[PDB]
Tab-separated table of C-alpha atoms and ligand atoms in Angstrom:
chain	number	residue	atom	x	y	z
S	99	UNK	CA	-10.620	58.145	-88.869
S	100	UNK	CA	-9.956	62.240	-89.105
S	101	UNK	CA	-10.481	65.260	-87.175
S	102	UNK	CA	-14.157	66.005	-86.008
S	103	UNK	CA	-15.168	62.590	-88.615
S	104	UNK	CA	-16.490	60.665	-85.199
S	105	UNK	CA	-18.775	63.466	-84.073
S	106	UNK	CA	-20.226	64.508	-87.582
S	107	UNK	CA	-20.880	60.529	-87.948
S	108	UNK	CA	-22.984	60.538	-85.087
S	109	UNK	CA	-24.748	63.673	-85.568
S	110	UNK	CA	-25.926	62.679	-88.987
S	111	UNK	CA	-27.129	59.349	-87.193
S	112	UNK	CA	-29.049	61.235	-84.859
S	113	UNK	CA	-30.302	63.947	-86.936
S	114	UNK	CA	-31.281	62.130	-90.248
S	115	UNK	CA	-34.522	61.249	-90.528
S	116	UNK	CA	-36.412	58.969	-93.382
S	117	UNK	CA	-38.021	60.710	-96.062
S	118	UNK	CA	-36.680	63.854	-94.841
S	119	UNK	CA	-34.051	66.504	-96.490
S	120	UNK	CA	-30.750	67.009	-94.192
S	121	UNK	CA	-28.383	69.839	-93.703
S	122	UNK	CA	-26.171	70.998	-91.047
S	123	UNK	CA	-22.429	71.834	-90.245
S	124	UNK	CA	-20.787	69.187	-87.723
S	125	UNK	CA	-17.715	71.801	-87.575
S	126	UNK	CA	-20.139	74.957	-86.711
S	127	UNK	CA	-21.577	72.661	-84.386
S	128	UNK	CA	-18.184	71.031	-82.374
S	129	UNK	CA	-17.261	74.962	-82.635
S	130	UNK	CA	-19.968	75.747	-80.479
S	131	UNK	CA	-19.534	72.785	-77.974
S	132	UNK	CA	-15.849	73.512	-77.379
S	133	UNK	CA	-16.179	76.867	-76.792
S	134	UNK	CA	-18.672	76.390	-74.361
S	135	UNK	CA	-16.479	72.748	-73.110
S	136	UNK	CA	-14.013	75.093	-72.160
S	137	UNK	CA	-15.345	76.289	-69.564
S	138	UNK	CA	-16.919	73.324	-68.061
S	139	UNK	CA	-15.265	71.232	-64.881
S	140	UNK	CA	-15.766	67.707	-63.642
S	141	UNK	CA	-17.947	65.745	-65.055
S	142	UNK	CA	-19.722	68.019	-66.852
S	143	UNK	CA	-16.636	68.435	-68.917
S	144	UNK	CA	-15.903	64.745	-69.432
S	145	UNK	CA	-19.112	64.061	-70.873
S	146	UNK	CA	-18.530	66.649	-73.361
S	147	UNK	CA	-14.971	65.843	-73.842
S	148	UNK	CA	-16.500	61.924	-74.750
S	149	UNK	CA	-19.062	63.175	-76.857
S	150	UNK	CA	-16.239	64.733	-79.341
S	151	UNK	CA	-13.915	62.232	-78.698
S	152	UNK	CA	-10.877	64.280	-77.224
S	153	UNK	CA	-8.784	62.145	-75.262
S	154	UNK	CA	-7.288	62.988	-72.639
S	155	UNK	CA	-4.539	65.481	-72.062
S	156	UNK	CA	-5.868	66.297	-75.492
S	157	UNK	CA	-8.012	68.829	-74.796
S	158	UNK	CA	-5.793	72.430	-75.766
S	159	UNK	CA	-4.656	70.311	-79.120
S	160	UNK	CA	-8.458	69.893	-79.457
S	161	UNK	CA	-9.350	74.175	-79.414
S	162	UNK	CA	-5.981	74.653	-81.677
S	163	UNK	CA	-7.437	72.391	-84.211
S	164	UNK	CA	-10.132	74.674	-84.553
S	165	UNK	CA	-9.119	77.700	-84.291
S	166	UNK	CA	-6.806	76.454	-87.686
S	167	UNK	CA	-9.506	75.054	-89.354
S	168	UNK	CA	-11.374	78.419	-88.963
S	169	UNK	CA	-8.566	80.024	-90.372
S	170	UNK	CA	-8.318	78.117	-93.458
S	171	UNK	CA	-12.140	78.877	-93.732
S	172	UNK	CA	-11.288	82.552	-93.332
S	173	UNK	CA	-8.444	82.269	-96.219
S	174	UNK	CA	-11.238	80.298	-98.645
S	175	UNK	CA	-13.710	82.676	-98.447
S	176	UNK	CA	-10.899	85.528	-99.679
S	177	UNK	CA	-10.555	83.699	-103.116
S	178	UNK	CA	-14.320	84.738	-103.705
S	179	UNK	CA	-15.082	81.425	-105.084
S	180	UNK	CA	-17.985	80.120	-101.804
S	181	UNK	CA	-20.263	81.676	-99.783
S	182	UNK	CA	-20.139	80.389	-96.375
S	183	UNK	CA	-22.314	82.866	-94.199
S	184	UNK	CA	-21.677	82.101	-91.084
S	185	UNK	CA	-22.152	83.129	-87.169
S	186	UNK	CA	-21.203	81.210	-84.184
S	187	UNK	CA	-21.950	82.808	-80.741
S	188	UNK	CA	-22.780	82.085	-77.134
S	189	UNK	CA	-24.707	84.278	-74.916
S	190	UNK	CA	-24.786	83.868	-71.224
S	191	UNK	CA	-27.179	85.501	-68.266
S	192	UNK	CA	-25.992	88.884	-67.862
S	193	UNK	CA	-24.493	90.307	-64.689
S	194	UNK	CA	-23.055	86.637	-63.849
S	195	UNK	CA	-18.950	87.759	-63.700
S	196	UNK	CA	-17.308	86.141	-66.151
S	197	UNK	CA	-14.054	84.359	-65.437
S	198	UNK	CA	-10.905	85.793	-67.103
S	199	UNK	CA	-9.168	82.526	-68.000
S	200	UNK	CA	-12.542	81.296	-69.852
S	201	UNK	CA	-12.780	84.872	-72.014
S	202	UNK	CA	-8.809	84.663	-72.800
S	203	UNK	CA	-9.081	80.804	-73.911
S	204	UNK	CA	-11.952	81.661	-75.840
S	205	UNK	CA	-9.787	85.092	-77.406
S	206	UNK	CA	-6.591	83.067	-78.148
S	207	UNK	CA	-8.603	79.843	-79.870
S	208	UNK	CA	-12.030	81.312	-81.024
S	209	UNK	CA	-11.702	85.478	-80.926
S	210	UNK	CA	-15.799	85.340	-80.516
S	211	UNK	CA	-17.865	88.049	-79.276
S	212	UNK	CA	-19.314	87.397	-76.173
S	213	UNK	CA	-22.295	89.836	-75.480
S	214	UNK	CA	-24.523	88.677	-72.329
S	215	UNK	CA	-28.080	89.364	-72.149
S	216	UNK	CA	-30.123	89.783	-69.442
S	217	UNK	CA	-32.405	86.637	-70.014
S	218	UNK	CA	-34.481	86.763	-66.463
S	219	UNK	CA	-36.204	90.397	-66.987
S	220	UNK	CA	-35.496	91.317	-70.800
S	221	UNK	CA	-36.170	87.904	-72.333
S	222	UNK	CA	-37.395	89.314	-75.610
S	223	UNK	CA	-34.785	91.779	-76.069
S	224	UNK	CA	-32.283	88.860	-75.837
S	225	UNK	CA	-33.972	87.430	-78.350
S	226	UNK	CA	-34.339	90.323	-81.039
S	227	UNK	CA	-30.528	90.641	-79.895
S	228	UNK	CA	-29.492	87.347	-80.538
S	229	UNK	CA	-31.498	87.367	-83.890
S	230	UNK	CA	-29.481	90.664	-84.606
S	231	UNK	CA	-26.260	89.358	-84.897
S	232	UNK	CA	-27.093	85.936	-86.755
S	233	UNK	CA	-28.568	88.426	-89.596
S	234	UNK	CA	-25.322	90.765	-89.145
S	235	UNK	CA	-23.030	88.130	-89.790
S	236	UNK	CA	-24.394	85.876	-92.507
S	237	UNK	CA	-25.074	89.401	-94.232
S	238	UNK	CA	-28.889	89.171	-93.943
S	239	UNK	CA	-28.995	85.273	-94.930
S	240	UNK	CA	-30.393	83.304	-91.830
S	241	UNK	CA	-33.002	86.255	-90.778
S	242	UNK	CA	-35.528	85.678	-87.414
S	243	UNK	CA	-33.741	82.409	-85.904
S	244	UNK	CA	-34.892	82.336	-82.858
S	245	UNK	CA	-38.829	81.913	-82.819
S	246	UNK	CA	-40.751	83.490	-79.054
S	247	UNK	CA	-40.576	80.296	-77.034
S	248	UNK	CA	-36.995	79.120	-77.010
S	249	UNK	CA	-35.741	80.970	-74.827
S	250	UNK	CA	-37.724	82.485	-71.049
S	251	UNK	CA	-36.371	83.742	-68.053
S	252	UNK	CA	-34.779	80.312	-67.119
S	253	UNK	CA	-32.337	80.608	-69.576
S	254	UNK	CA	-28.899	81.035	-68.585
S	255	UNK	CA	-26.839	80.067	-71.681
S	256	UNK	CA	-27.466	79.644	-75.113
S	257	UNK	CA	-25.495	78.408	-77.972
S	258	UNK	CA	-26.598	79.703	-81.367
S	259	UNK	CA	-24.672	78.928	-84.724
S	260	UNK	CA	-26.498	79.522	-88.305
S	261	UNK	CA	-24.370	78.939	-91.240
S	262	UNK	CA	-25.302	79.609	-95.184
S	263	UNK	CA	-23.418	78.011	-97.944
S	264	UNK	CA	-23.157	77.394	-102.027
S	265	UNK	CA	-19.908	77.532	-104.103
S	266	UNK	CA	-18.528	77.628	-107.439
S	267	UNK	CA	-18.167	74.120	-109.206
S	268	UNK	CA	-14.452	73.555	-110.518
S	269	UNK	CA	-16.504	71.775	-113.448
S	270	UNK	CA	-19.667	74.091	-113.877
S	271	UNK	CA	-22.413	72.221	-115.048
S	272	UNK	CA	-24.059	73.410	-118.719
S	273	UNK	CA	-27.858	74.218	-118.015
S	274	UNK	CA	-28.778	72.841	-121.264
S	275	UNK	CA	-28.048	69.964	-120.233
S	276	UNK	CA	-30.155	70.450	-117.045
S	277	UNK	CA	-33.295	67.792	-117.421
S	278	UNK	CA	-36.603	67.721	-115.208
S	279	UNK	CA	-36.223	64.130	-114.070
S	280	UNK	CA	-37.973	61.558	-111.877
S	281	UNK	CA	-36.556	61.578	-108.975
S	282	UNK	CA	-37.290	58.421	-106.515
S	283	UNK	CA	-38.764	59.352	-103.413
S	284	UNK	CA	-39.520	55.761	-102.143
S	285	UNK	CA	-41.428	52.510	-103.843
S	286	UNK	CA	-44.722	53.846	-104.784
S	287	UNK	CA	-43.640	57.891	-104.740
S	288	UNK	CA	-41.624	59.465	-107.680
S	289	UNK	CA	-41.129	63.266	-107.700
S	290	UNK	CA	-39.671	65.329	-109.770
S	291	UNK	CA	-36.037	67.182	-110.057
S	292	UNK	CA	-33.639	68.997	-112.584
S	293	UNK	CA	-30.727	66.532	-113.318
S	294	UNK	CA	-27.805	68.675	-114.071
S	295	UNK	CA	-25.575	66.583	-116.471
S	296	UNK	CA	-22.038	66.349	-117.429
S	297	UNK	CA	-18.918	63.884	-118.240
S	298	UNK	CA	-15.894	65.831	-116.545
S	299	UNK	CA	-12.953	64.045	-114.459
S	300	UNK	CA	-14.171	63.767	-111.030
S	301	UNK	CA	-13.283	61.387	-107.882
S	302	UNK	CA	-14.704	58.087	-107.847
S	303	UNK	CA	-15.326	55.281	-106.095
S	304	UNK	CA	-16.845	52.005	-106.246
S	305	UNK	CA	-17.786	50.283	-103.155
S	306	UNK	CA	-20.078	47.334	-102.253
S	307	UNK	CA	-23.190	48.919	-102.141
S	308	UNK	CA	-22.726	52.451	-103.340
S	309	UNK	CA	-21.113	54.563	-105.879
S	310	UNK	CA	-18.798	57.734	-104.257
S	311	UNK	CA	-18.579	60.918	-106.721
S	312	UNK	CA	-16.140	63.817	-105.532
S	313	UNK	CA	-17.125	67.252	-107.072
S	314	UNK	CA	-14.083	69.965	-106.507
S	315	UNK	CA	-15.210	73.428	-105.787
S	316	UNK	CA	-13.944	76.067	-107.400
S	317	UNK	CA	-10.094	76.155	-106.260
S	318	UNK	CA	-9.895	72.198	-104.926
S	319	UNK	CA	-10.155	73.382	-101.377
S	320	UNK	CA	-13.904	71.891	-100.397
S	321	UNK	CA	-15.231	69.220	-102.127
S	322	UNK	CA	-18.797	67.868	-102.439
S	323	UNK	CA	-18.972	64.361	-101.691
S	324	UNK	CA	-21.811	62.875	-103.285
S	325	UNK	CA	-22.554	58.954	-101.640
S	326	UNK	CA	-25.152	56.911	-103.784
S	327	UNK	CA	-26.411	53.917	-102.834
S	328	UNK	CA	-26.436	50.823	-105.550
S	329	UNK	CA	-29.989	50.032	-104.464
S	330	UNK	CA	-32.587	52.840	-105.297
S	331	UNK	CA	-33.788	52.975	-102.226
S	332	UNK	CA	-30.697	51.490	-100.269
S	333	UNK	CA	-29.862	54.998	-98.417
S	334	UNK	CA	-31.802	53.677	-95.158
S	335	UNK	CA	-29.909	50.332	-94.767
S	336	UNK	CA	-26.446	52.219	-95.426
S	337	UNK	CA	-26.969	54.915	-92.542
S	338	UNK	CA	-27.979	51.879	-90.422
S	339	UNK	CA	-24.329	50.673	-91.194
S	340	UNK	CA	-22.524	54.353	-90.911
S	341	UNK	CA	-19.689	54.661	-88.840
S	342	UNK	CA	-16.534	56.618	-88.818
S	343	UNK	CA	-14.368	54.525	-90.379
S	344	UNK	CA	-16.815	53.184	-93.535
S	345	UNK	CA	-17.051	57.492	-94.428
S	346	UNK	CA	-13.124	57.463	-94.081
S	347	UNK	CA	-12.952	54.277	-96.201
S	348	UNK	CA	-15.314	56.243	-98.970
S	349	UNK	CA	-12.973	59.217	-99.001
S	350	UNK	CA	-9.715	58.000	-99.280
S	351	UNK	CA	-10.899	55.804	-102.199
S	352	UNK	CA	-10.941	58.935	-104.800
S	353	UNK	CA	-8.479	58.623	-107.764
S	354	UNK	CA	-9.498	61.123	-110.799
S	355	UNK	CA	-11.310	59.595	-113.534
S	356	UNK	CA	-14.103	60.727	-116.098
S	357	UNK	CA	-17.097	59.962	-115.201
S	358	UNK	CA	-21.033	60.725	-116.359
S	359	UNK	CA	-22.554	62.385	-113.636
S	360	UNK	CA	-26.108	63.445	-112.803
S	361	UNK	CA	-26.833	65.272	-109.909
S	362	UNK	CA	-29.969	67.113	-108.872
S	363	UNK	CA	-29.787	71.009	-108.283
S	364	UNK	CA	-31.444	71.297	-105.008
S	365	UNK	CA	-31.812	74.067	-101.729
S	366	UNK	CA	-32.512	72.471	-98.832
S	367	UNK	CA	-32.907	73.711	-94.873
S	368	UNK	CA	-33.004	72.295	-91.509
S	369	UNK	CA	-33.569	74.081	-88.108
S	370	UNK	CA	-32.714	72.100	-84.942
S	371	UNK	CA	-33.091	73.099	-80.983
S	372	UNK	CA	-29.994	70.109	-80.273
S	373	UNK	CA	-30.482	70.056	-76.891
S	374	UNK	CA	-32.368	66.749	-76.877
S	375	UNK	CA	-29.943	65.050	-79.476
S	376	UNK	CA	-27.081	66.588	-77.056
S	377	UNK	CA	-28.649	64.222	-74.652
S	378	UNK	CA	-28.852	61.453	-76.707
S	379	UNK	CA	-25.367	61.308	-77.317
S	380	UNK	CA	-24.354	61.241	-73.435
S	381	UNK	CA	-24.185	65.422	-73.057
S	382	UNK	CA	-26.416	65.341	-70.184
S	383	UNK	CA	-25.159	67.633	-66.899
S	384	UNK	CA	-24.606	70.037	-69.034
S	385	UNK	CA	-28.418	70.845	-69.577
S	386	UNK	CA	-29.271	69.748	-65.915
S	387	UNK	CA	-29.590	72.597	-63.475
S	388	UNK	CA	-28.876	70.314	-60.493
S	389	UNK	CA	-25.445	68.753	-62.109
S	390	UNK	CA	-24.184	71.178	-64.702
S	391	UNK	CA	-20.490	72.380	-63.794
S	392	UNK	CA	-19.615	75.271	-66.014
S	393	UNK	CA	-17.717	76.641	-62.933
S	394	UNK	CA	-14.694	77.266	-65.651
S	395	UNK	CA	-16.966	80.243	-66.868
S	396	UNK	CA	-17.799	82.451	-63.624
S	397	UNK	CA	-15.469	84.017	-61.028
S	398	UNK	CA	-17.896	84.527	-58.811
S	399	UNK	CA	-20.043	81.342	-57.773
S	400	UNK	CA	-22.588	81.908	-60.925
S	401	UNK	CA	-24.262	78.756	-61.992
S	402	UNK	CA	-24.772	78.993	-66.058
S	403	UNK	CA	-25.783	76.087	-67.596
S	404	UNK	CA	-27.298	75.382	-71.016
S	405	UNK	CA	-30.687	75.990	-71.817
S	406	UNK	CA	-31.199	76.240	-75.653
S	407	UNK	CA	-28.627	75.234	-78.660
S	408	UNK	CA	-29.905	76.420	-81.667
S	409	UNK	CA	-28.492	75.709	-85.739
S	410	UNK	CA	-29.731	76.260	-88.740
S	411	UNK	CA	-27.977	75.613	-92.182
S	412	UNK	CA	-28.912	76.453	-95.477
S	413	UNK	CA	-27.233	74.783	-99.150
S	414	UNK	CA	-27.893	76.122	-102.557
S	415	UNK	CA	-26.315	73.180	-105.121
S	416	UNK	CA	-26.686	74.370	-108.668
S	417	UNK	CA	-24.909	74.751	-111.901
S	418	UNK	CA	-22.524	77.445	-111.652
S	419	UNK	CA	-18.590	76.802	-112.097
S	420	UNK	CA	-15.509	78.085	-113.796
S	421	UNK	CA	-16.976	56.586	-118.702
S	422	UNK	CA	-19.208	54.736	-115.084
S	423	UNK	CA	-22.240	56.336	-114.734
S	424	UNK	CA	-23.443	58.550	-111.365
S	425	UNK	CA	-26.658	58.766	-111.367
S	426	UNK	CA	-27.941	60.501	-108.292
S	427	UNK	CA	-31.760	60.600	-108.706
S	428	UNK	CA	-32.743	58.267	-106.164
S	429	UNK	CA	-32.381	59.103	-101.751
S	430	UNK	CA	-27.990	59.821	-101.188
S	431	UNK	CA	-25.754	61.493	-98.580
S	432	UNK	CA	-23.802	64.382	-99.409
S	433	UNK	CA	-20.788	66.023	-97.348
S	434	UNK	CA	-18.799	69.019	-97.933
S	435	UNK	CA	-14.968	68.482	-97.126
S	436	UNK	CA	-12.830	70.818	-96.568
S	437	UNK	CA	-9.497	68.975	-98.074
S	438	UNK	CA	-6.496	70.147	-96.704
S	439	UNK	CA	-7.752	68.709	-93.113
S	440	UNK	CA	-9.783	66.234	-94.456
S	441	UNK	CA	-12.824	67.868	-91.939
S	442	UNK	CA	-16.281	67.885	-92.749
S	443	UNK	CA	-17.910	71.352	-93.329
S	444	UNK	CA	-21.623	70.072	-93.648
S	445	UNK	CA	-23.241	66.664	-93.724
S	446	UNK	CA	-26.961	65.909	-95.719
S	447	UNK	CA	-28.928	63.947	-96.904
S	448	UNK	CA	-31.266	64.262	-100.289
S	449	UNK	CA	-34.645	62.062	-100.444
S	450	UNK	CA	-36.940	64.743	-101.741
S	451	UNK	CA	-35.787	67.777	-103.801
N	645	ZN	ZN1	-18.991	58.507	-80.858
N	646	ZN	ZN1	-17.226	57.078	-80.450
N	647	ZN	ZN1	-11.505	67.197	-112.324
N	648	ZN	ZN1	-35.060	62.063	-75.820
C-alpha cells in the first residue's frame, strides 16, 4: 500500500541475501526503469508496466509521480541538512536516431541528459564516459563504476544510476555514549559494533514479531526506519513473510513516544549488474535481442535493447544531529522514507557491521 512500496518490496526480496549487508534505492531504481519504459511498445512495455505495478491507463500518472518526487528531493537537499549524491542516466548506441516524442517525455517528466556513445567501435571510451558523469554528479562520491567487462560492442543500452547518502539526525546521538558492542552475526558468530545510545521521542511500534523505531532526519522530511526482529536472529523468517502491505502496516503504526534506542553506526555498499534480478521479476523482452520492443525510442527502425543496468548505493549512519527498549544489535531492515509521499528512498539490511 503506497507509491513505488510494491516494487521496493520485491527488490529487497530479490536482492537480500543471508549474512550479507544491503543497500540500494528502489526510487533511483523505478527512475531508471520508467524512463527507459517509456519508450518501450507491446509487450515489452507490459512486462515492465507489471513489474512496477502501473495499471493501466495509468501509465503518464505513473512518470508525473516521479518527476514530483524528484522535486521534493531537489527542495530537501536545499535545506543542507542530507547528502544524497546522486546520478541517474541512460546511454544508448550512438548514431541510432532518436525519436522526438521519447526525448520530450523524458524532458517534461525526467529533464535527464541523454548522451549516446558509440558502444560497437569505442567501447572503452563509453565506459570512461559513462564513469565520467557518475563521478560529476555525486561530486566525486561513486568513482570507477563501471569495471572493463560490462559493457562490449553488443551493447546497445545501458541504464546506470549510483546514489550516495547520510543525513543529519533530528536527535543527534552523544558519542559518549557510543559503546563497542557485540553485535550478533548468527548462533555461533558475534562481531563487534559501536552502539550509539540515546532516550529521545521517536516513532514506535510494537508488532508480533518485531519492534519498529522511526528516526527523523534533520527537518522531518526522510525518516530512517529501523525494523528489529523480536527473535535475535528472526530477520530471515520475517523477509520470508515481507510483502507490501506488512511494510505499510509497520509504517503507519508510528505515534511519538520516548524510547531507549541503540543503534549501530555503520557504512555499508552494494554494487549490482540487475539485469538478472530484472528477469526474475518477469522483465524479460526487454533484455532479449530477438523480442525487445523499445520501438518508442528510435525514428528510424533502430533496435536498442538493454544490455547492462548498473546501481550502486552507498549509506554512512552515524551520530551527527541538531521508556521500551530498541535494541538493534542483532541482523534488522532499515528503510529511508521520504514522508510527505510516504516513498521509499533506500531499502537495507544490517547483519554484519
Ligand atoms: Zn509485485
Ligand atoms: Zn505485485
Ligand atoms: Zn522526536
Ligand atoms: Zn537467473
Amino acid at each position: 500500500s503506497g507509491s513505488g512500496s510494491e516494487l521496493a518490496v520485491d527488490l529487497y526480496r530479490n536482492l537480500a541475501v543471508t549474512g550479507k549487508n544491503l543497500f540500494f534505492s528502489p526510487s533511483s531504481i523505478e527512475t531508471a526503469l520508467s524512463m527507459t519504459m517509456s519508450g518501450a511498445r507491446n509487450r515489452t512495455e507490459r512486462q515492465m508496466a507489471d513489474v512496477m505495478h502501473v495499471g493501466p491507463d495509468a501509465m503518464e500518472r505513473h512518470h508525473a509521480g516521479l518527476a514530483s518526487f524528484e522535486k521534493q528531493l531537489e527542495s530537501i537537499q536545499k535545506k543542507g541538512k542530507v547528502t544524497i549524491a546522486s546520478s541517474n542516466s541512460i546511454w544508448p548506441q550512438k548514431n541510432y536516431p532518436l525519436a522526438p516524442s521519447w526525448l520530450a517525455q523524458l524532458k517534461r517528466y525526467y529533464g535527464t541528459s541523454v548522451t549516446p556513445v558509440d558502444y560497437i567501435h569505442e567501447t572503452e571510451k563509453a565506459r570512461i564516459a559513462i564513469n565520467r558523469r557518475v563521478e560529476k554528479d555525486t561530486k566525486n562520491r561513486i568513482r570507477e563504476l563501471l569495471k572493463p567487462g560490462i559493457l562490449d560492442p553488443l551493447t546497445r543500452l545501458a541504464l546506470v544510476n549510483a546514489v550516495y547518502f547520510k543525513g543529519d539526525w533530528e536527535h543527534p546521538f552523544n558519542e559518549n555514549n557510543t559503546v563497542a558492542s557485540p553485535f550478533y552475526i548468527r548462533q555461533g558468530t558475534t562481531g563487534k559494533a559501536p552502539l550509539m545510545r540515546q532516550s529521545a521521542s521517536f516513532g514506535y511500534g510494537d508488532h508480533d514479531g518485531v519492534q519498529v523505531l522511526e528516526l527523523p532526519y534533520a527537518g522531518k522530511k526522510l525518516s530512517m526506519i529501523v525494523v528489529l526482529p523480536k527473535e535475535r536472529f528472526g530477520l530471515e523468517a520475517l523477509e520470508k513473510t515481507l510483502t507490501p502491505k506488512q511494510f505499510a502496516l509497520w509504517t503507519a503504526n508510528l505515534s511519538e513516544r520516548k524510547i531507549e534506542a541503540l543503534l549501530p553506526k555503520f557504512r555499508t555498499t552494494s554494487a549490482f549488474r540487475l539485469d538478472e534480478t530484472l528477469r526474475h521479476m518477469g522483465m524479460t523482452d526487454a533484455f532479449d535481442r530477438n523480442l525487445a520492443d523499445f520501438s518508442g525510442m528510435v525514428s528510424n527502425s533502430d533496435k536498442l535493447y538493454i544490455g547492462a543496468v548498473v546501481h550502486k548505493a552507498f549509506v554512512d549512519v552515524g551520530e551527527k544531529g541538531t521508556v521500551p527498549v530498541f535494541k538493534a544489535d542483532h541482523p534488522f531492515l532499515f528503510a529511508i522514507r521520504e514522508n510527505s509521499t510516504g516513498r521509499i528512498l533506500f531499502m537495507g539490511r544490517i547483519s554484519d557491521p
